[PDB]
Structure formats: structure tokens, C-alpha cells
Amino acid sequence: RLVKGYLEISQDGYGFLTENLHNLESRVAIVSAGLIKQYALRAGDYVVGQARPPRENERYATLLKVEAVNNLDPEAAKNRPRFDELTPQFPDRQIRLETTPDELSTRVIDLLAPIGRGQRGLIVAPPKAGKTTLLKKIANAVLKNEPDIKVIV
Amino acid sequence: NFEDAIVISEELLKRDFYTSIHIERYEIEARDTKLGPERITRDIPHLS
Ligand SMILES: Nc1ncnc2c1ncn2[C@@H]1O[C@H](COP(=O)(O)OP(=O)(O)O)[C@@H](O)[C@H]1O
């Protein structure tokens, strides 16, 4: 039996695997502090692994084994630079925009604020100014220009 | 059997021959302290 989720480490050194709803669920899989220590897992890590039905007196299924972390084999977890330790730089890879239902918006944005990778951007508008619709256009344009980029909304 | 000591063979334990059920009746409560009501909760904050 296989389960998957995102790692959420508790105060007590153990964690749970969550679903898209991003909360506590009945189907979350227990992860012992051990597995965390061997695989050097961290909060937000995506864990997939074969699980078993919980034993009697157990309320949550337990991850018998870890197969992949963040879609890659667990070994790279032990030896990797920590995110906090990554060298920040300026956004050096522009992302050019277009969305078919409104190319006016995307082209104006490109002419107004070209987008790069690592961008810390903001759109500022009063209520009812298309900010939501503009964000929709950006989502659509990124899902056409940069499918490789993990698009989280 | 020294002064009034009684020596017993094992069998009376092998047989269900001297036993009773003892009943214990514990109790607790939560209060609303001016420092803060004492929630009856499952939480042990610190360690385990
Ligand atoms: N590019 C657009 N074309 C047509 N209608 C728009 C456009 N941008 C905004 N609107 C209209 O403005 C209203 C508010 O847009 P939206 O950004 O979704 O809400 P808010 O800006 O209040 O969060 C919507 O009802 C929408 O019909």
C-alpha cells in the first residue's frame, strides 16, 4: 500500500503527511522522528512511500518505508545545501508573458514590468480593479510560457 | 507459623478460591482561574 503527501514535522520530532487541503486530515500518514533523521526530511518536503494499515490502537497509517522525497530518491536529501543557505541573486531569467484571451494585458505587463526567475513582485490596486482577473491572466500566461515552472496559486 | 502467622499451600491460588474485585473512584475538575481557566485537554506541551 502506497501513500503520499507533504511533510509536516510536529513539535515532538515526528510528522504527518498532508493532502492538498493543507491541514490535519484523518488520512495523514504518521512519520516517525527516525525516518526524518535518516532522510534529513524538512517541513514542506513531499514524501511518497509504501504505507500499511494502522495497527490496532493506531489511528493513522504509518509510512513503513520512504521511496521518494520531492519526487526524487531520498539520498539527495542527506547531502544538499539548505534553502536558507542558498545564495540570493537578482532575477536573471526573464519570463516573457502571453495569454491568448488577453494578450493586451500580458504585453503591457512585459512593457511595464518584465518578469524574471526569483522575482519578488507585487500588483497594487484598489478594490475592483482587475487585480484578481490580472492574476488569472498571469496564471494562464505562465501555464503557457513556463510549464516547467511549478505553478502554485 | 511463628506467633499467629498462617502458612498456606499454593492450591488456593491455583483455584479461584480467595479473591475479590476492588473498585477505585477517582475524580478531577477543570476550573476557570483568573489566570486562565484550567482547560481539561489532551495536551502535554513540552516533550512527549
Ligand atoms: N480585463 C477585464 N475585462 C473585463 N472586465 C474586467 C477586467 N478586469 C476587471 N473586470 C471587472 O472588474 C470586476 C472586479 O475584478 P476582480 O479583479 O476580479 O475583482 P477585485 O479587483 O475587486 O478583486 C469584475 O467583476 C470584472 O468583471
Ligand SMILES: [Mg+2]
Ligand atoms: Mg479580488
